[PDB]
PDB file of C-alpha atoms in Angstrom:
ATOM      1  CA  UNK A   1     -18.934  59.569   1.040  1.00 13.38           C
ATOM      2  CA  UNK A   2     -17.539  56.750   1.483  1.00 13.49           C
ATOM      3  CA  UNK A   3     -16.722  54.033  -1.183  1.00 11.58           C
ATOM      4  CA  UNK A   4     -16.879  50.052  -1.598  1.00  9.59           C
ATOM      5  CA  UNK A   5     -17.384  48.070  -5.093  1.00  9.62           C
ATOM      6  CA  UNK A   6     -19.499  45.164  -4.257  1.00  8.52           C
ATOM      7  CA  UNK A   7     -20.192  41.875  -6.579  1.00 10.60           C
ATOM      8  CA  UNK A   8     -17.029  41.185  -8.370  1.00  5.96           C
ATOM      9  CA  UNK A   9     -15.680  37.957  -7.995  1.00  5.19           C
ATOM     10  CA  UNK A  10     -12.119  40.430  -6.397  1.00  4.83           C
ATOM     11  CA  UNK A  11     -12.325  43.471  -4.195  1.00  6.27           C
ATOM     12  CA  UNK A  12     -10.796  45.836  -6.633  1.00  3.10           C
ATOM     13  CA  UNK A  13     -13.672  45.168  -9.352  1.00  3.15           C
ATOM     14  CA  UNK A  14     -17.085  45.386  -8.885  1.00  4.76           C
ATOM     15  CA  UNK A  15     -20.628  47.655  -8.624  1.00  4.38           C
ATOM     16  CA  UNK A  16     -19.582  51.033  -7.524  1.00  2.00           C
ATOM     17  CA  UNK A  17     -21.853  51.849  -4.067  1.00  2.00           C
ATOM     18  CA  UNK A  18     -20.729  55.343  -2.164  1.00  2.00           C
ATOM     19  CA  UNK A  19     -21.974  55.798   1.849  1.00  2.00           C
ATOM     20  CA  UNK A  20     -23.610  58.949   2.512  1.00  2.00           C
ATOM     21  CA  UNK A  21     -24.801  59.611   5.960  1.00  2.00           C
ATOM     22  CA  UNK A  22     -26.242  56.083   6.670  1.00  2.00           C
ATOM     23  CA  UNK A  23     -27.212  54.873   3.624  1.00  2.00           C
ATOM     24  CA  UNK A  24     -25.316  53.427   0.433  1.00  2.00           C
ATOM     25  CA  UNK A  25     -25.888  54.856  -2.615  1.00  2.00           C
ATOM     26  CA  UNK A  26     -25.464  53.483  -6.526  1.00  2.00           C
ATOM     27  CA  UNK A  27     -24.202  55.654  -9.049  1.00  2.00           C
ATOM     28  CA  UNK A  28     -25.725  55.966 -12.469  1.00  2.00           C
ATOM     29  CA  UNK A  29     -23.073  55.151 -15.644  1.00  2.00           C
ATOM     30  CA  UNK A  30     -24.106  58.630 -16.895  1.00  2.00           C
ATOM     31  CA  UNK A  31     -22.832  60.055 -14.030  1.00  2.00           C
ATOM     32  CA  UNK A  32     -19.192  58.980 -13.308  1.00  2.00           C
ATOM     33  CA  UNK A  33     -16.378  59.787 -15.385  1.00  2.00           C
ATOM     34  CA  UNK A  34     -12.606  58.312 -15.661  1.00  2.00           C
ATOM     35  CA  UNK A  35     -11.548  60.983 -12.877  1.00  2.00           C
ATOM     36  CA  UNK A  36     -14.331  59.418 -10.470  1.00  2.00           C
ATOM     37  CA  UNK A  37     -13.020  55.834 -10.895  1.00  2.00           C
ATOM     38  CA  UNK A  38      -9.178  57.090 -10.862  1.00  2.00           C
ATOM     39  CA  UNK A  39     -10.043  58.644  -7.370  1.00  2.00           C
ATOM     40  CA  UNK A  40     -12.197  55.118  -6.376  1.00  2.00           C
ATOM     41  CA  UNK A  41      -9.792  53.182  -7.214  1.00  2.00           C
ATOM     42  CA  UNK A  42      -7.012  54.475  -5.322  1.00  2.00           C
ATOM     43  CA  UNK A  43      -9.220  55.632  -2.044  1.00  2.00           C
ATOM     44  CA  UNK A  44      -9.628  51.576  -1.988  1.00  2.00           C
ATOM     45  CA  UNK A  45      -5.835  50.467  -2.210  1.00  2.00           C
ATOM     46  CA  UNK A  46      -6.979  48.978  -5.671  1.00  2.00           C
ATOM     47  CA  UNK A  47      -4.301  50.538  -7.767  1.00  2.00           C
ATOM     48  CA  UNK A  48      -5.761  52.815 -10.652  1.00  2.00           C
ATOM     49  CA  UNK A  49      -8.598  52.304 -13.015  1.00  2.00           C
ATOM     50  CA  UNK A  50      -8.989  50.218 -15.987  1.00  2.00           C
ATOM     51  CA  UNK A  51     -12.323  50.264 -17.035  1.00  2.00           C
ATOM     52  CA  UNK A  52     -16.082  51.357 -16.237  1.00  2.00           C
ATOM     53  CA  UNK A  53     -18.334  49.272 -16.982  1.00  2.00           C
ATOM     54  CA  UNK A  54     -21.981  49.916 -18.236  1.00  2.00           C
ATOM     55  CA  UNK A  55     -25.564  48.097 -17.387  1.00  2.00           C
ATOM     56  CA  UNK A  56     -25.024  46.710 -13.885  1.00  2.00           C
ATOM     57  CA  UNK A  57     -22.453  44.292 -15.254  1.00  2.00           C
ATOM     58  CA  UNK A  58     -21.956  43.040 -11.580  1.00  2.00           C
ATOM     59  CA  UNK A  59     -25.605  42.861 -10.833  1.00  2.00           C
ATOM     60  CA  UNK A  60     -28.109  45.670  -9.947  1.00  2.00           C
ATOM     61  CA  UNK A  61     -28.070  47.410  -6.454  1.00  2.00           C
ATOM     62  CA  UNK A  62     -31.380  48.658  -4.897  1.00  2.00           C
ATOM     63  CA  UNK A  63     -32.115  51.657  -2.453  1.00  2.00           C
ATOM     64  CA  UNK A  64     -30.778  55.069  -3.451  1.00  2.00           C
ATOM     65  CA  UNK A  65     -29.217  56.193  -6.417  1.00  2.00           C
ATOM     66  CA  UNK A  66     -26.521  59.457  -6.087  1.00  2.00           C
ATOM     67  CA  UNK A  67     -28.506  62.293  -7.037  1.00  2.00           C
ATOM     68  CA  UNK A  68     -25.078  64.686  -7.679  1.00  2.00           C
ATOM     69  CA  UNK A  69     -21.799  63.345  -9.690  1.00  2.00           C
ATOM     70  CA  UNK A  70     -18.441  63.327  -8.487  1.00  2.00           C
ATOM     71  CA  UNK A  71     -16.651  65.398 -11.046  1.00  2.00           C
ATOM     72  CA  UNK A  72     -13.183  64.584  -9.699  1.00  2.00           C
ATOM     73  CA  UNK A  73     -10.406  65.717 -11.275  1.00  2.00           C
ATOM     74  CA  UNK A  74      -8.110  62.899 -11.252  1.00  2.00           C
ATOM     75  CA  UNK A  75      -5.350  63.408  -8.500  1.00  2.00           C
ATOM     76  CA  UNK A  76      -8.085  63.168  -4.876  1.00  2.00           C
ATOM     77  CA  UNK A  77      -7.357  61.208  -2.521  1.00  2.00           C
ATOM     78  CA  UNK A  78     -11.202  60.410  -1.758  1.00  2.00           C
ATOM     79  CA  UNK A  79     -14.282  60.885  -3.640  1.00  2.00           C
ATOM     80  CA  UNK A  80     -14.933  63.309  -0.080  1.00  2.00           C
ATOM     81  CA  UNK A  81     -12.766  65.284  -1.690  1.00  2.00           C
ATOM     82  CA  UNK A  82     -14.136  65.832  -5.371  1.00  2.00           C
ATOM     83  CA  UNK A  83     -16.169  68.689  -6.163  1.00  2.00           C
ATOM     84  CA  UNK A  84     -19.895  67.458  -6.775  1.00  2.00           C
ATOM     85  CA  UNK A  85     -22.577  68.474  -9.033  1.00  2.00           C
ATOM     86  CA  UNK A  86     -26.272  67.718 -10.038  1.00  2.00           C
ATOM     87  CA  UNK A  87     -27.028  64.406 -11.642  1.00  2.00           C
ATOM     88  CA  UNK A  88     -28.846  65.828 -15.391  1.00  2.00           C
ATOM     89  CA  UNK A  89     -32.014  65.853 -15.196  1.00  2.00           C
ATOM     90  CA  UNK A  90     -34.773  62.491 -15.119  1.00  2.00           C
ATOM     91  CA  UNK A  91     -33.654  60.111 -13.102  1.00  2.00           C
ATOM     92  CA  UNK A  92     -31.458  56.756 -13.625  1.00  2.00           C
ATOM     93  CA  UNK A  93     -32.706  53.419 -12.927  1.00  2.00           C
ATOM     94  CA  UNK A  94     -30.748  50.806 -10.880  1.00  2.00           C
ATOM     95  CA  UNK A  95     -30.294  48.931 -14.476  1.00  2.00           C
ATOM     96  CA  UNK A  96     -27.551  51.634 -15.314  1.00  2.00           C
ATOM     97  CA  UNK A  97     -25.587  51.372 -12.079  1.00  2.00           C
ATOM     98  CA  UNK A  98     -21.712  51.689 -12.793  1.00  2.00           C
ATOM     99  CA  UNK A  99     -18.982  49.777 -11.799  1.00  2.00           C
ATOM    100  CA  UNK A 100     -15.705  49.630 -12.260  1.00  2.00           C
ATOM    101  CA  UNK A 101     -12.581  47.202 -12.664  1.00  2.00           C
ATOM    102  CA  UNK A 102      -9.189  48.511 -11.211  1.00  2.00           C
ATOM    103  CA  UNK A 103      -5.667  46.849 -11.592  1.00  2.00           C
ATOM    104  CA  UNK A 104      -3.856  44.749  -9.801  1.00  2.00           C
TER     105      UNK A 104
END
């Protein structure tokens, strides 16, 4: 469960993509709450949260999409640690990955 933000223009904003086993996964913008980010953000020495942001604002990413959501609540250490839960139901397309902008 490991997490990177890839695309922004700085490490510590970008498309959120989280490893499981050996393949990245995208997470849908319905799917990730302030808690998640919080927890992202500081997992990646990126200070805390600002904002998510909607509608692949730093591009699209392709292969998998995460299937469960991290409902973190606020004070993890890593998204590893975050209780998970199913994803509601349908499916998200790669046009509603999230990402995320943290301070600093």
């Amino acid at each position: 469960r490991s997490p990177r933000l890839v695309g922004a223009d700085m490490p510590c904003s970008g498309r959120v993509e989280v490893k499981h086993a050996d393949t990245w996964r995208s997470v849908c913008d319905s799917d990730f709450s302030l808690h998640a980010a919080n927890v992202l953000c500081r997992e990646l020495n990126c200070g805390d949260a600002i904002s998510l942001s909607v509608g692949d604002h730093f591009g699209k990413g392709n292969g998998l999409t995460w299937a469960e959501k991290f409902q973190c609540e606020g004070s993890e250490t890593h998204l590893a640690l975050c209780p998970i839960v199913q994803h509601p139901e349908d499916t998200c397309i790669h046009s509603r990955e999230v990402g995320v902008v943290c301070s600093t």
